[PDB]
Amino acid sequence: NIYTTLKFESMMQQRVIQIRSIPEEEYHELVSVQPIQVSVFVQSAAKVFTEFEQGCDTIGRSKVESIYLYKFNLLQTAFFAMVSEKVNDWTQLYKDVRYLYTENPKLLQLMELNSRRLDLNLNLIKKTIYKLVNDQLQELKDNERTPDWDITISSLLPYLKKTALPTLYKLEDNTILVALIRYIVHDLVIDNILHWRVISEKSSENLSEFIMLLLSGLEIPRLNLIETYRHSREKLGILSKILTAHLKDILEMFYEGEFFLFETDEIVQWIILLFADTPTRRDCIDEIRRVREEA
Amino acid sequence: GSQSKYLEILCVLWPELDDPKNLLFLRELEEEVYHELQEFISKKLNNKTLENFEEWLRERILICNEMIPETPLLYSVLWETAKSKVLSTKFIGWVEGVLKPLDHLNKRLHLIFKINEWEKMPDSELFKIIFDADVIEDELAPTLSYGKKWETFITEFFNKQQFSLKSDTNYQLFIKLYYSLEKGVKEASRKLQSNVVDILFHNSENLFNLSSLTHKLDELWSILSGFPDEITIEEQKTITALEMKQFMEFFIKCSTKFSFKEIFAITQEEESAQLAHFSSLCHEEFNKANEISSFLQAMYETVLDISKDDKIFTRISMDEKLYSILEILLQMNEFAYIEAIIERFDYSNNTQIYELLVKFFWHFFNNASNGLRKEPEMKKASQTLQIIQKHMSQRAGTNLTKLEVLLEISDKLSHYSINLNAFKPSNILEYRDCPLDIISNLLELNPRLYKDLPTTKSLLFGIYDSLSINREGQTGKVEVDLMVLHIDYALVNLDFGTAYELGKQVFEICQEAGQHMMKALGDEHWLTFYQMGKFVDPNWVDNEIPTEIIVLQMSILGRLLEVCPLEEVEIVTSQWSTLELELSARDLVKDKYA
C-alpha cells in the first residue's frame, strides 16, 4: 500500500527520464508518417505513454487503480509543458501532439491541453486583428474628410497575408480558417460598425472603401465551397453596397433578395444609421418590416 | 779665618732690623777686590758653613725673615744690582720661584707666611691655599715651575673631582688652568691630556647642561684636536683620536642625546643593544626635528656615513641601521622620507624592504575600520603600495596587482550596507571560502543591487583574484550561482521582470555549458525557478496574476521540467497546470489583465 506507492513513483521517474532522453535533434527534424509530416520526437514520445501502461502492468491495475488516472494525467501534463519549450513552431507542435492522440486516443489530457493551446494562439491572432481593426475604424470615425489608411495598408493587410493566414494554413484544418474569417467579419467589423452612433455620408464611403481592402485580405479561394465562408464575404460585399446606396436602391435591393443574409432588425438599423429621418426613411422602414412580416 | 768664619758671624750678629743696604759692602767685596761664641753662630746657622756671598744671602734672608715675616723681599736690593754672576741663576730662580710667589700670596690674602714654613709646606696644602688669573700667572706657575711640581699639581687638582663642569664658571676655570698648564709643560703633558679626557668623560652630562654648549664644544674640539693618537684614563679605558673626532663630531653635528660616558658604553655593547640604542636615537631625533631631512643630513655626516666606518655603533651594519630607520618612518607614516631613503641607498627591489613594506600594508589594512579611500588606515595602506609600485615592481610581481585590487574592492564594498556582525576590510579575508556570503548580504541590505549584475560580479571576481582563490574553469559555474542569487533577490523585491530575464539567461549559459551544467543547475538551483514560477505580487491589481506573467511563469516551469530533480516533477507540473487553467479562463482579446 505504501510499497506500491514507492514503485509507482520510481517508474513515474523512469518515464520522465525517458522524455529527457529524447535526443534534442528530434525536436527539429521532420519525418513523413502515415501523408502528414510530424516532428521526429513524436515516435519516441509515443513510446513513453505506451511504456506507462507497460509499467502499470508490472503491478496490474487494482494496485494502481486509485491513483492511475491522476498520475496518467500528470505525465501528459509534464510532457506537454516540457515539449512546449522544445518545439519552435507552435503549429508543428499542435500537429505533433495531434498525431500523438490520434494514434493513441487514451491521451485525453493531451487533447485538452493541445486544443486549449490552439485556442490561445487563435485568440492571440484575434487580439492582434481586433486592435488593428478597432484602430483603423476609430481613425475613420474621427477623421472623415482625410482619414489615414496606414493601419490597413501597412499593418492589417500584410499581417493577414504574410503572417496570420500562412501560419494558420500550416494547421491543415480549414475549419479554423473559416472560424477566423467568420469572427473577423461578424463579431468584429460588422458588429463594430453597427454600434456607431450615426454613420455620415463621407464615413459611409470610407467604411465601404475599408471593407473592399478588407475583403482583399480575407480571400482564401481554397474555402470557396464552405458555406459560412462564402456567406461571410457576401454579407460584407453587400454591406459595401448598402453603405453607399441611396434610399431607393436599398428598397430595390431588398426586393431583389440581396438582404437575404440580413435579419430584418439589422436592415432597419442600417437605414437608421445611414439616413436622416424623413417621410421617405419612414415609409421605407415600415415597408421592409411589412414584407418580411408577410413572407 | 777662613772667610767662611767672617761671613758666618756677619750673618747672625748683624741686627736683623738694619737696612739691607748697610750690608751692600759685603757684595762689592765679592764683585771685585767667650771664644765659645762660635757655638751660637753655628747654633743659628745650624752647622751650615757659609762659603760665599750667594750662600751668605740665602742665610741672611732667612735669619731676617725670622723677625720681619711681612717683608720676604726685604733683601731685594742686594740681589737686584748684582754684578756678573755673583749670584747663580739658582739664586734668582728662588726669588722668582719662592720669595715672589710667597710675597704675592701674603699680600693678596693679608697673611705673613715665613719663607721657611712656606717651603717646607706639604705641596698638597700649598696648592690648597693657592685655591680659594693674576693668581695663576704669578703665584701658581712660578711655584709649579720652580719645584718642578707640574705633574703633581695636575694630578691632584686638575681632575674630575675639582672640575665637575656643573657651572659655567667652573668650566671657564677648567679652560684657563688647562691653557697655562699646557704652556708650562713640554710626560706631565700626557697627564694633563689624560686628565682633560678624564674630566670630559665623566662630566659630559654636566657640560651638556652648560650655556653656549655649541660654542663650548667648539672650544673643546680646539684643544682635543691637538692631542696624541691615543689617550688612557681611569680604569683601563682607552680612546683613540679617530674615535674622539667622531664622538665630538657626533655631539657637534648630530646629537647630544647620549653623554660621552654613554657613547663609550655603546661602543662596547652587544650588536643587539647597539641597534636598540640606534633606533632610540632615530625615533627621538625624528620627533624633535623641525624637519626630518635636517637630522638625516646630520646622520649622513656622521653615524650613517657610507664613506667611512662608524666608531660609535661599531657592531651594526649600514643595512641594519637603514632598516631600523625605515621601520621607524613607516610607523610614523612618513612615506615621502621612506621613498627618499630607498632612492639614496639604492634599495630598489630589495627583498627585506619589500617584506617590510608588505608587512606594513597588512598592518594598516587590518587596522582599518572601513574600506573607503578616505579612511586614514586605508590611506596609509594605499601610500604603502605606491611605494611598492615606485620601488619594488620586480620583486612584487603579480602580488602588487592583487593588493591594489583588494584595496579597490574594499572601497566599493564600503559604499553599501553590510551587516555581517561595522564591516572591516579585514573581514573580507575571513570570507575567503564563502565569498558569495558577502554578495548575498549586499543584495539583501541594498534593495536595488540585484539590478546591477556587472558590479556585484566584479566584486566577486575581485575577491577571487585578490585573495588568490582558485578558479579552475569553475568561473562558468560561479557566474551562474551569482545570477541565481540575483533572481532570488529580484523576487524578494517584487521584480518578476528582472527575475525572468536572469532566469532565461541562466538557462542559456547552462544549455551551452552542456549536460553537466544542466544537471548542476537543476539539482542545486531548481527551488529558485520553482519560486519564480510560483511568484505572487501582493500589489497586483485585484490579486490577479497578469496574463503576460502567467505565460512567462508557465514557460520557466516547463524549462524547469527538463532539469529539476525527479522528486520535484509533480509539484512543478501541478503549478504549471494551475497557471494553464487560469490562463484558459481569460478573454485574451479584451483582457482586463497584463
mmCIF file of C-alpha atoms in Angstrom, chain B residues 216-519:
data_model
loop_
_atom_site.group_PDB
_atom_site.id
_atom_site.type_symbol
_atom_site.label_atom_id
_atom_site.label_comp_id
_atom_site.label_asym_id
_atom_site.label_seq_id
_atom_site.Cartn_x
_atom_site.Cartn_y
_atom_site.Cartn_z
ATOM 1 C CA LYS B 216 81.923 75.285 24.285
ATOM 2 C CA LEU B 217 82.045 72.129 22.159
ATOM 3 C CA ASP B 218 83.994 74.024 19.531
ATOM 4 C CA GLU B 219 86.331 75.392 22.174
ATOM 5 C CA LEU B 220 86.959 71.875 23.491
ATOM 6 C CA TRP B 221 87.428 70.436 19.974
ATOM 7 C CA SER B 222 90.032 73.200 19.502
ATOM 8 C CA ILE B 223 92.024 71.606 22.325
ATOM 9 C CA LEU B 224 91.234 67.912 21.867
ATOM 10 C CA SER B 225 92.202 68.123 18.205
ATOM 11 C CA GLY B 226 95.835 68.582 19.165
ATOM 12 C CA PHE B 227 96.066 65.523 21.423
ATOM 13 C CA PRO B 228 98.050 62.389 20.526
ATOM 14 C CA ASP B 229 96.757 59.340 18.590
ATOM 15 C CA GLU B 230 95.699 57.597 21.792
ATOM 16 C CA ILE B 231 94.818 58.533 25.367
ATOM 17 C CA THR B 232 94.170 56.494 28.508
ATOM 18 C CA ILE B 233 92.146 57.324 31.617
ATOM 19 C CA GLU B 234 90.601 55.907 34.771
ATOM 20 C CA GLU B 235 90.113 52.118 34.726
ATOM 21 C CA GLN B 236 91.717 50.933 31.514
ATOM 22 C CA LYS B 237 89.508 52.977 29.217
ATOM 23 C CA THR B 238 91.362 53.939 26.050
ATOM 24 C CA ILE B 239 90.118 56.349 23.398
ATOM 25 C CA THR B 240 91.805 56.978 20.014
ATOM 26 C CA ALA B 241 91.981 60.264 18.076
ATOM 27 C CA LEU B 242 89.707 58.889 15.369
ATOM 28 C CA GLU B 243 87.138 57.888 17.965
ATOM 29 C CA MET B 244 87.381 61.226 19.719
ATOM 30 C CA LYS B 245 86.905 63.022 16.414
ATOM 31 C CA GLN B 246 83.710 61.093 15.588
ATOM 32 C CA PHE B 247 82.373 61.290 19.139
ATOM 33 C CA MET B 248 82.819 65.069 19.203
ATOM 34 C CA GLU B 249 81.573 65.311 15.613
ATOM 35 C CA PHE B 250 78.509 63.420 16.748
ATOM 36 C CA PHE B 251 77.845 65.841 19.634
ATOM 37 C CA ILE B 252 78.515 68.852 17.451
ATOM 38 C CA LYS B 253 76.763 67.880 14.241
ATOM 39 C CA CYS B 254 74.222 65.235 15.189
ATOM 40 C CA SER B 255 73.015 64.696 18.761
ATOM 41 C CA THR B 256 73.682 65.321 22.447
ATOM 42 C CA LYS B 257 71.189 62.652 23.440
ATOM 43 C CA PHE B 258 74.000 60.492 24.856
ATOM 44 C CA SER B 259 76.750 61.715 27.177
ATOM 45 C CA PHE B 260 80.404 60.902 26.469
ATOM 46 C CA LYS B 261 80.188 58.082 29.047
ATOM 47 C CA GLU B 262 77.063 56.613 27.398
ATOM 48 C CA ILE B 263 78.640 56.886 23.928
ATOM 49 C CA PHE B 264 81.612 54.903 25.166
ATOM 50 C CA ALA B 265 79.301 52.251 26.612
ATOM 51 C CA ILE B 266 77.501 51.875 23.253
ATOM 52 C CA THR B 267 80.952 51.303 21.771
ATOM 53 C CA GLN B 268 81.275 48.200 23.923
ATOM 54 C CA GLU B 269 77.704 46.863 23.909
ATOM 55 C CA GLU B 270 76.472 43.824 22.013
ATOM 56 C CA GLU B 271 75.038 44.176 18.469
ATOM 57 C CA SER B 272 71.512 43.917 19.864
ATOM 58 C CA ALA B 273 71.870 46.695 22.436
ATOM 59 C CA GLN B 274 73.575 48.897 19.826
ATOM 60 C CA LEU B 275 70.712 48.524 17.354
ATOM 61 C CA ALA B 276 68.240 49.364 20.084
ATOM 62 C CA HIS B 277 70.203 52.439 21.124
ATOM 63 C CA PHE B 278 70.436 53.360 17.477
ATOM 64 C CA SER B 279 66.698 53.292 16.786
ATOM 65 C CA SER B 280 66.007 55.064 20.038
ATOM 66 C CA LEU B 281 68.243 57.840 18.784
ATOM 67 C CA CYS B 282 66.487 57.928 15.434
ATOM 68 C CA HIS B 283 62.967 57.911 16.859
ATOM 69 C CA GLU B 284 63.742 60.587 19.462
ATOM 70 C CA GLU B 285 65.534 62.858 16.975
ATOM 71 C CA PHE B 286 62.999 62.408 14.144
ATOM 72 C CA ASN B 287 60.421 63.592 16.677
ATOM 73 C CA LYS B 288 62.334 66.716 17.712
ATOM 74 C CA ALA B 289 63.476 67.831 14.248
ATOM 75 C CA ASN B 290 61.800 70.788 12.579
ATOM 76 C CA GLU B 291 62.193 68.642 9.505
ATOM 77 C CA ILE B 292 63.336 65.017 9.372
ATOM 78 C CA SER B 293 65.669 65.829 6.484
ATOM 79 C CA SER B 294 67.829 68.045 8.662
ATOM 80 C CA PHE B 295 68.531 65.208 11.077
ATOM 81 C CA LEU B 296 69.042 62.710 8.233
ATOM 82 C CA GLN B 297 71.566 65.023 6.661
ATOM 83 C CA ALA B 298 73.396 65.226 10.024
ATOM 84 C CA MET B 299 73.470 61.443 10.248
ATOM 85 C CA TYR B 300 74.816 61.258 6.695
ATOM 86 C CA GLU B 301 77.744 63.324 8.053
ATOM 87 C CA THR B 302 78.355 61.005 10.968
ATOM 88 C CA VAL B 303 76.764 57.754 12.045
ATOM 89 C CA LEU B 304 75.137 56.917 8.692
ATOM 90 C CA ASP B 305 78.147 57.808 6.560
ATOM 91 C CA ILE B 306 78.870 55.244 3.864
ATOM 92 C CA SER B 307 82.300 56.717 3.206
ATOM 93 C CA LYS B 308 83.881 55.674 6.495
ATOM 94 C CA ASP B 309 83.137 53.273 9.295
ATOM 95 C CA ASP B 310 81.247 54.195 12.417
ATOM 96 C CA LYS B 311 83.298 54.245 15.614
ATOM 97 C CA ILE B 312 80.198 54.701 17.730
ATOM 98 C CA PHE B 313 77.737 51.999 16.581
ATOM 99 C CA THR B 314 80.568 49.589 15.971
ATOM 100 C CA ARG B 315 78.759 46.335 15.604
ATOM 101 C CA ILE B 316 75.805 47.099 13.319
ATOM 102 C CA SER B 317 75.818 47.444 9.542
ATOM 103 C CA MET B 318 74.588 50.295 7.353
ATOM 104 C CA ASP B 319 71.794 47.973 6.240
ATOM 105 C CA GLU B 320 70.590 47.197 9.758
ATOM 106 C CA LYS B 321 70.598 50.922 10.546
ATOM 107 C CA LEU B 322 68.697 51.872 7.458
ATOM 108 C CA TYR B 323 66.222 49.035 8.029
ATOM 109 C CA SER B 324 65.618 50.173 11.615
ATOM 110 C CA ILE B 325 65.029 53.661 10.224
ATOM 111 C CA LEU B 326 62.536 52.540 7.565
ATOM 112 C CA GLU B 327 60.614 50.680 10.220
ATOM 113 C CA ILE B 328 60.572 53.839 12.348
ATOM 114 C CA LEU B 329 59.466 56.002 9.445
ATOM 115 C CA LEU B 330 56.690 53.542 8.480
ATOM 116 C CA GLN B 331 55.177 53.585 11.980
ATOM 117 C CA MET B 332 55.466 57.342 11.690
ATOM 118 C CA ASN B 333 53.636 57.369 8.364
ATOM 119 C CA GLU B 334 56.451 59.384 6.808
ATOM 120 C CA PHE B 335 56.102 57.852 3.355
ATOM 121 C CA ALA B 336 57.976 60.600 1.475
ATOM 122 C CA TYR B 337 61.102 60.077 3.593
ATOM 123 C CA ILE B 338 60.804 56.332 3.131
ATOM 124 C CA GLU B 339 60.970 56.997 -0.576
ATOM 125 C CA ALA B 340 63.932 59.368 -0.334
ATOM 126 C CA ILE B 341 65.902 56.856 1.770
ATOM 127 C CA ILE B 342 65.098 53.955 -0.605
ATOM 128 C CA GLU B 343 66.325 56.073 -3.543
ATOM 129 C CA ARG B 344 69.518 57.302 -1.893
ATOM 130 C CA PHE B 345 70.907 53.951 -0.755
ATOM 131 C CA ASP B 346 69.602 52.207 -3.839
ATOM 132 C CA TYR B 347 67.330 49.686 -2.161
ATOM 133 C CA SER B 348 65.185 49.180 -5.264
ATOM 134 C CA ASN B 349 63.597 45.718 -5.296
ATOM 135 C CA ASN B 350 65.342 44.749 -2.068
ATOM 136 C CA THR B 351 63.753 41.611 -0.631
ATOM 137 C CA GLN B 352 63.922 42.690 3.004
ATOM 138 C CA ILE B 353 62.430 46.126 2.256
ATOM 139 C CA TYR B 354 59.724 44.515 0.117
ATOM 140 C CA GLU B 355 58.674 42.328 3.024
ATOM 141 C CA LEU B 356 58.686 45.245 5.473
ATOM 142 C CA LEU B 357 56.525 47.326 3.165
ATOM 143 C CA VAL B 358 54.168 44.372 2.646
ATOM 144 C CA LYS B 359 54.049 43.665 6.395
ATOM 145 C CA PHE B 360 53.013 47.262 6.983
ATOM 146 C CA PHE B 361 50.434 47.217 4.201
ATOM 147 C CA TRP B 362 48.658 44.421 6.057
ATOM 148 C CA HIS B 363 49.070 46.197 9.363
ATOM 149 C CA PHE B 364 47.309 49.275 8.018
ATOM 150 C CA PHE B 365 44.794 47.093 6.206
ATOM 151 C CA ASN B 366 43.829 45.127 9.325
ATOM 152 C CA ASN B 367 43.641 48.322 11.337
ATOM 153 C CA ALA B 368 41.161 49.970 9.012
ATOM 154 C CA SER B 369 37.614 50.303 10.348
ATOM 155 C CA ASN B 370 36.088 50.734 6.891
ATOM 156 C CA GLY B 371 37.238 50.407 3.285
ATOM 157 C CA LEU B 372 36.648 53.937 1.998
ATOM 158 C CA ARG B 373 39.618 55.522 0.241
ATOM 159 C CA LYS B 374 39.465 58.406 2.755
ATOM 160 C CA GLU B 375 39.765 56.288 5.922
ATOM 161 C CA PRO B 376 43.175 57.084 7.450
ATOM 162 C CA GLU B 377 44.326 53.460 7.611
ATOM 163 C CA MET B 378 43.286 52.776 4.015
ATOM 164 C CA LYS B 379 45.190 55.931 3.004
ATOM 165 C CA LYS B 380 48.373 54.532 4.605
ATOM 166 C CA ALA B 381 47.742 51.131 3.024
ATOM 167 C CA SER B 382 47.497 52.971 -0.278
ATOM 168 C CA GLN B 383 50.659 55.026 0.359
ATOM 169 C CA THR B 384 52.476 51.782 1.243
ATOM 170 C CA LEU B 385 51.563 50.236 -2.166
ATOM 171 C CA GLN B 386 52.510 53.351 -4.137
ATOM 172 C CA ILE B 387 55.961 52.805 -2.620
ATOM 173 C CA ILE B 388 55.885 49.136 -3.551
ATOM 174 C CA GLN B 389 54.836 50.315 -7.011
ATOM 175 C CA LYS B 390 57.519 53.008 -7.423
ATOM 176 C CA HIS B 391 60.401 50.999 -5.929
ATOM 177 C CA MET B 392 59.538 47.262 -5.890
ATOM 178 C CA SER B 393 57.691 46.223 -9.126
ATOM 179 C CA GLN B 394 60.076 43.371 -9.981
ATOM 180 C CA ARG B 395 60.019 41.769 -6.531
ATOM 181 C CA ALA B 396 56.269 42.319 -6.160
ATOM 182 C CA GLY B 397 55.384 40.609 -9.428
ATOM 183 C CA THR B 398 51.726 39.632 -9.651
ATOM 184 C CA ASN B 399 51.300 40.387 -5.950
ATOM 185 C CA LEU B 400 51.048 44.159 -6.452
ATOM 186 C CA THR B 401 48.089 43.671 -8.767
ATOM 187 C CA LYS B 402 46.207 41.651 -6.160
ATOM 188 C CA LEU B 403 46.856 44.160 -3.352
ATOM 189 C CA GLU B 404 45.920 47.138 -5.488
ATOM 190 C CA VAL B 405 42.729 45.251 -6.378
ATOM 191 C CA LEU B 406 41.930 44.247 -2.771
ATOM 192 C CA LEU B 407 42.032 47.933 -1.835
ATOM 193 C CA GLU B 408 39.714 48.736 -4.697
ATOM 194 C CA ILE B 409 37.002 46.279 -3.691
ATOM 195 C CA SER B 410 37.401 47.460 -0.119
ATOM 196 C CA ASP B 411 36.386 50.951 -1.278
ATOM 197 C CA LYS B 412 33.448 49.587 -3.354
ATOM 198 C CA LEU B 413 32.188 47.382 -0.549
ATOM 199 C CA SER B 414 32.126 50.311 1.861
ATOM 200 C CA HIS B 415 29.588 52.100 -0.350
ATOM 201 C CA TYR B 416 26.880 49.592 0.646
ATOM 202 C CA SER B 417 25.188 48.412 3.824
ATOM 203 C CA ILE B 418 26.728 45.270 5.276
ATOM 204 C CA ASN B 419 25.516 43.651 8.471
ATOM 205 C CA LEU B 420 27.611 40.507 8.820
ATOM 206 C CA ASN B 421 28.061 41.071 12.587
ATOM 207 C CA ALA B 422 30.515 47.592 11.198
ATOM 208 C CA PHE B 423 32.366 45.846 8.389
ATOM 209 C CA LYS B 424 36.183 45.913 8.391
ATOM 210 C CA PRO B 425 38.085 45.362 5.182
ATOM 211 C CA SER B 426 39.885 42.668 7.213
ATOM 212 C CA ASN B 427 36.646 40.696 7.409
ATOM 213 C CA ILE B 428 36.832 40.182 3.637
ATOM 214 C CA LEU B 429 39.723 37.754 4.193
ATOM 215 C CA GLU B 430 37.525 35.843 6.674
ATOM 216 C CA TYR B 431 35.071 35.026 3.830
ATOM 217 C CA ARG B 432 37.755 33.530 1.563
ATOM 218 C CA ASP B 433 35.935 30.175 1.443
ATOM 219 C CA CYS B 434 32.473 31.662 1.047
ATOM 220 C CA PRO B 435 32.815 34.891 -0.979
ATOM 221 C CA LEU B 436 29.182 34.651 -2.098
ATOM 222 C CA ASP B 437 28.055 35.114 1.522
ATOM 223 C CA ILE B 438 29.318 38.678 1.170
ATOM 224 C CA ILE B 439 27.412 39.224 -2.059
ATOM 225 C CA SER B 440 24.259 37.738 -0.522
ATOM 226 C CA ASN B 441 24.380 40.148 2.423
ATOM 227 C CA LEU B 442 24.772 43.071 -0.008
ATOM 228 C CA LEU B 443 21.792 42.045 -2.178
ATOM 229 C CA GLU B 444 19.679 41.798 0.964
ATOM 230 C CA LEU B 445 20.683 45.084 2.607
ATOM 231 C CA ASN B 446 20.926 47.102 -0.590
ATOM 232 C CA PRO B 447 17.499 46.716 -2.213
ATOM 233 C CA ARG B 448 18.445 47.876 -5.702
ATOM 234 C CA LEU B 449 21.681 45.943 -6.111
ATOM 235 C CA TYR B 450 20.003 42.912 -7.715
ATOM 236 C CA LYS B 451 19.717 45.103 -10.835
ATOM 237 C CA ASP B 452 23.483 45.681 -11.043
ATOM 238 C CA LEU B 453 24.977 42.300 -12.001
ATOM 239 C CA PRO B 454 28.002 43.969 -13.682
ATOM 240 C CA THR B 455 29.307 45.343 -10.357
ATOM 241 C CA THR B 456 28.327 42.618 -7.907
ATOM 242 C CA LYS B 457 30.185 40.489 -10.425
ATOM 243 C CA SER B 458 33.419 42.482 -10.381
ATOM 244 C CA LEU B 459 33.284 42.422 -6.574
ATOM 245 C CA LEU B 460 33.024 38.640 -6.567
ATOM 246 C CA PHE B 461 35.773 38.071 -9.086
ATOM 247 C CA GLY B 462 37.887 40.787 -7.483
ATOM 248 C CA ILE B 463 37.629 38.819 -4.241
ATOM 249 C CA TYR B 464 38.729 35.639 -6.051
ATOM 250 C CA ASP B 465 41.743 37.333 -7.680
ATOM 251 C CA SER B 466 42.862 39.463 -4.736
ATOM 252 C CA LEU B 467 42.783 36.547 -2.317
ATOM 253 C CA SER B 468 44.294 34.209 -4.913
ATOM 254 C CA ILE B 469 41.242 31.960 -4.743
ATOM 255 C CA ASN B 470 41.338 29.134 -7.270
ATOM 256 C CA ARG B 471 39.059 29.272 -10.363
ATOM 257 C CA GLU B 472 39.524 26.066 -12.391
ATOM 258 C CA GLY B 473 37.159 26.970 -15.227
ATOM 259 C CA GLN B 474 34.735 26.941 -12.314
ATOM 260 C CA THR B 475 34.081 30.533 -13.332
ATOM 261 C CA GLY B 476 31.216 29.488 -15.617
ATOM 262 C CA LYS B 477 29.599 27.812 -12.616
ATOM 263 C CA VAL B 478 30.402 30.782 -10.353
ATOM 264 C CA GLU B 479 28.719 33.271 -12.691
ATOM 265 C CA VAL B 480 25.637 31.060 -12.574
ATOM 266 C CA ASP B 481 25.490 30.819 -8.793
ATOM 267 C CA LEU B 482 25.843 34.597 -8.792
ATOM 268 C CA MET B 483 22.937 35.021 -11.186
ATOM 269 C CA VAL B 484 20.593 32.700 -9.285
ATOM 270 C CA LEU B 485 21.208 34.904 -6.221
ATOM 271 C CA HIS B 486 20.084 37.914 -8.238
ATOM 272 C CA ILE B 487 16.913 36.088 -9.198
ATOM 273 C CA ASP B 488 16.372 35.251 -5.549
ATOM 274 C CA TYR B 489 16.504 38.930 -4.544
ATOM 275 C CA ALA B 490 14.628 40.237 -7.573
ATOM 276 C CA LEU B 491 11.652 38.137 -6.424
ATOM 277 C CA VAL B 492 12.249 39.258 -2.871
ATOM 278 C CA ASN B 493 11.920 42.789 -4.258
ATOM 279 C CA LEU B 494 8.796 42.020 -6.283
ATOM 280 C CA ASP B 495 10.549 42.422 -9.620
ATOM 281 C CA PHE B 496 9.483 39.461 -11.780
ATOM 282 C CA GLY B 497 10.740 41.129 -14.961
ATOM 283 C CA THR B 498 14.373 41.134 -13.871
ATOM 284 C CA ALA B 499 13.987 37.719 -12.299
ATOM 285 C CA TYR B 500 12.799 36.294 -15.603
ATOM 286 C CA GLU B 501 15.470 37.878 -17.812
ATOM 287 C CA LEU B 502 18.178 36.477 -15.481
ATOM 288 C CA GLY B 503 16.411 33.104 -15.244
ATOM 289 C CA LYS B 504 16.241 32.963 -19.036
ATOM 290 C CA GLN B 505 19.882 33.944 -19.454
ATOM 291 C CA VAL B 506 20.959 31.344 -16.887
ATOM 292 C CA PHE B 507 19.123 28.525 -18.682
ATOM 293 C CA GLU B 508 21.006 29.503 -21.835
ATOM 294 C CA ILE B 509 24.524 29.756 -20.389
ATOM 295 C CA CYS B 510 23.833 26.300 -18.978
ATOM 296 C CA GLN B 511 22.436 24.866 -22.247
ATOM 297 C CA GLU B 512 25.743 25.604 -23.950
ATOM 298 C CA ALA B 513 27.892 24.637 -20.966
ATOM 299 C CA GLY B 514 26.338 21.237 -21.666
ATOM 300 C CA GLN B 515 24.610 18.428 -19.756
ATOM 301 C CA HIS B 516 26.985 18.616 -16.782
ATOM 302 C CA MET B 517 25.940 22.224 -16.107
ATOM 303 C CA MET B 518 22.248 21.477 -16.771
ATOM 304 C CA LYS B 519 22.132 18.729 -14.143
#
